[PDB]
Design an enzyme around this catalytic site. Sequence first.
Site, PDB file in Angstrom:
ATOM      1  CG  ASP A 131      -2.054   1.052   1.079  1.00 55.63           C
ATOM      2  OD1 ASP A 131      -2.345   1.510  -0.044  1.00 55.63           O
ATOM      3  OD2 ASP A 131      -2.614   1.419   2.133  1.00 55.63           O
ATOM      4  NE  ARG A 135      -3.935   5.439   0.650  1.00 58.49           N
ATOM      5  CZ  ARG A 135      -3.804   5.292  -0.661  1.00 58.49           C
ATOM      6  NH1 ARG A 135      -3.730   6.373  -1.445  1.00 58.49           N
ATOM      7  NH2 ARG A 135      -3.757   4.079  -1.188  1.00 58.49           N
ATOM      8  CG  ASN A 136      -0.307   4.385   3.599  1.00 56.02           C
ATOM      9  OD1 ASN A 136      -1.008   4.791   4.527  1.00 56.02           O
ATOM     10  ND2 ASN A 136      -0.733   3.484   2.710  1.00 56.02           N
ATOM     11  CG  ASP A 149      -0.464   1.594   6.302  1.00 56.57           C
ATOM     12  OD1 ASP A 149      -1.087   1.197   7.309  1.00 56.57           O
ATOM     13  OD2 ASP A 149      -0.832   1.341   5.133  1.00 56.57           O
TER      14      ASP A 149
HETATM   15  C1  8ZW Z   1       2.218   6.034  16.686  1.00 60.71           C
HETATM   16  C2  8ZW Z   1       2.317   5.152  15.613  1.00 60.71           C
HETATM   17  C3  8ZW Z   1       1.959   3.816  15.803  1.00 60.71           C
HETATM   18  C4  8ZW Z   1       2.053   2.909  14.754  1.00 60.71           C
HETATM   19  C5  8ZW Z   1       2.509   3.339  13.512  1.00 60.71           C
HETATM   20  C6  8ZW Z   1       2.872   4.670  13.303  1.00 60.71           C
HETATM   21 CL1  8ZW Z   1       3.428   5.127  11.728  1.00 60.71          CL
HETATM   22  C7  8ZW Z   1       2.773   5.579  14.363  1.00 60.71           C
HETATM   23  N1  8ZW Z   1       3.135   6.884  14.194  1.00 60.71           N
HETATM   24  C8  8ZW Z   1       2.306   7.706  13.518  1.00 60.71           C
HETATM   25  O1  8ZW Z   1       1.228   7.323  13.069  1.00 60.71           O
HETATM   26  C9  8ZW Z   1       2.662   9.003  13.366  1.00 60.71           C
HETATM   27  C10 8ZW Z   1       3.846   9.585  13.632  1.00 60.71           C
HETATM   28  N2  8ZW Z   1       3.891  10.918  13.380  1.00 60.71           N
HETATM   29  C11 8ZW Z   1       2.743  11.426  12.873  1.00 60.71           C
HETATM   30  N3  8ZW Z   1       2.581  12.724  12.552  1.00 60.71           N
HETATM   31  C12 8ZW Z   1       1.424  13.270  12.084  1.00 60.71           C
HETATM   32  C13 8ZW Z   1       1.201  14.629  12.286  1.00 60.71           C
HETATM   33  C14 8ZW Z   1       0.046  15.257  11.825  1.00 60.71           C
HETATM   34  N4  8ZW Z   1      -0.163  16.573  12.034  1.00 60.71           N
HETATM   35  C15 8ZW Z   1       0.902  17.435  12.582  1.00 60.71           C
HETATM   36  C16 8ZW Z   1       0.813  18.872  12.071  1.00 60.71           C
HETATM   37  O2  8ZW Z   1      -0.545  19.346  12.151  1.00 60.71           O
HETATM   38  C17 8ZW Z   1      -1.337  18.596  11.211  1.00 60.71           C
HETATM   39  C18 8ZW Z   1      -1.478  17.158  11.692  1.00 60.71           C
HETATM   40  C19 8ZW Z   1      -0.907  14.520  11.129  1.00 60.71           C
HETATM   41  C20 8ZW Z   1      -0.693  13.170  10.903  1.00 60.71           C
HETATM   42  S1  8ZW Z   1      -1.846  12.188  10.044  1.00 60.71           S
HETATM   43  C21 8ZW Z   1      -2.505  10.968  11.159  1.00 60.71           C
HETATM   44  O3  8ZW Z   1      -2.986  13.057   9.514  1.00 60.71           O
HETATM   45  O4  8ZW Z   1      -1.123  11.481   8.896  1.00 60.71           O
HETATM   46  C22 8ZW Z   1       0.464  12.561  11.365  1.00 60.71           C
HETATM   47  S2  8ZW Z   1       1.637  10.151  12.771  1.00 60.71           S
END
Ligand code: 8ZW
Length: 268
Positions: A131, A135-136, A149
Site C-alpha cells: 500500500d 498518504r502512507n 503503515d
Molecule cells: C504512533 C504510531 C503507531 C504505529 C505506527 C505509526 Cl506510523 C505511528 N506513528 C504515527 O502514526 C505518526 C507519527 N507521526 C505522525 N505525525 C502526524 C502529524 C500530523 N499533524 C501534525 C501537524 O498538524 C497537522 C497534523 C498529522 C498526521 S496524520 C494521522 O494526519 O497522517 C500525522 S503520525
Amino acid sequence: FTTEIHPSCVTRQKVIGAGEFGEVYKGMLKKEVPVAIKTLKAGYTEKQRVDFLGEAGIMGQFSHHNIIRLEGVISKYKPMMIITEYMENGALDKFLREKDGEFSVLQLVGMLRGIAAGMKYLANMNYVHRDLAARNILVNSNLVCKVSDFGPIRWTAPEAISYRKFTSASDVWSFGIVMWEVMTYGERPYWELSNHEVMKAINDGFRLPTPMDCPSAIYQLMMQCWQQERARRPKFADIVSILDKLIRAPDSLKTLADFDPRVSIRLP
Ligand SMILES: Cc1cccc(Cl)c1NC(=O)c1cnc(Nc2cc(N3CCOCC3)cc(S(C)(=O)=O)c2)s1
C-alpha cells in the site's frame, strides 16, 4: 524484543488521527521528547491484537532513516499503546497539497530518494508493503520522508490487481505513482477516472502524463516503474542509484520533460 514503556512516561496531548479501535495522538515521552502514540482500546479482538502488536513487531525489526522509528510499546497496561517518533508535518499527500509550488525540484527529488531508500531497505528485508502511496508516507521538520503503515486500485500494479501477486516489483509500480504524486504536489492519480476506467486505461497501455516542471530523467524513471512486465521494472536499488546520481549532479534536473497542456490560451 520491543522496549516496554511505562504509562506514567507517556502524555497524550492532542488527537491527530484514526479512530474506532483507537486513536493516534501527538504527545510527549519522558527533557521530554515529542512522540506519536497509537492506542488499542478495551474489547479489541485477538486479530486486532496481533495486527496491533504485529505492526509494532514489524517496525521494531527495522532500523533505517526512512522508516518510522519505534520508541516502544505499552503492552502490560490498558489501553495498549505504540509510541513512535513524531513526524511534525504529517502525511505526505496532504502536506504537498497544502504547500503547492513551495519547494525546489531538488527538494522534491530528495524526498523521492528518501522514500526509495526506505523501500529498498524494506524490499531487501523481504517486506512487501502493498500500500505504498503518499498518504502512507510521513514528513518531519527536516523534510525527511519515512515509509509508514506496516502490518487502492490506482496505486496498484496490474498483476496485484489481476491475480493478487504483491511483490517488491509491485511496490516499484506504486513508487512510480508516488513519484508522480510528489512532482505534481499531490494531484490525484488519473484525476476523475473511475477505478474500472483506470484498470482499462493501464491495460490499454496508457500511462500518467508528465507533470508540470518535471525533470526529463524523473519522468523517464517513473515510466519505467510502470512497465506492464514485472521483470522489466527497475529494482529499488536501481531507483536509489539513479536518484542519488541526479541529486549529486543537480544540473541534470534542469532538463525538463515537455508538458502537454490541456488548455490553449492565445493572446494577439
Ligand atoms: C504512533 C504510531 C503507531 C504505529 C505506527 C505509526 Cl506510523 C505511528 N506513528 C504515527 O502514526 C505518526 C507519527 N507521526 C505522525 N505525525 C502526524 C502529524 C500530523 N499533524 C501534525 C501537524 O498538524 C497537522 C497534523 C498529522 C498526521 S496524520 C494521522 O494526519 O497522517 C500525522 S503520525
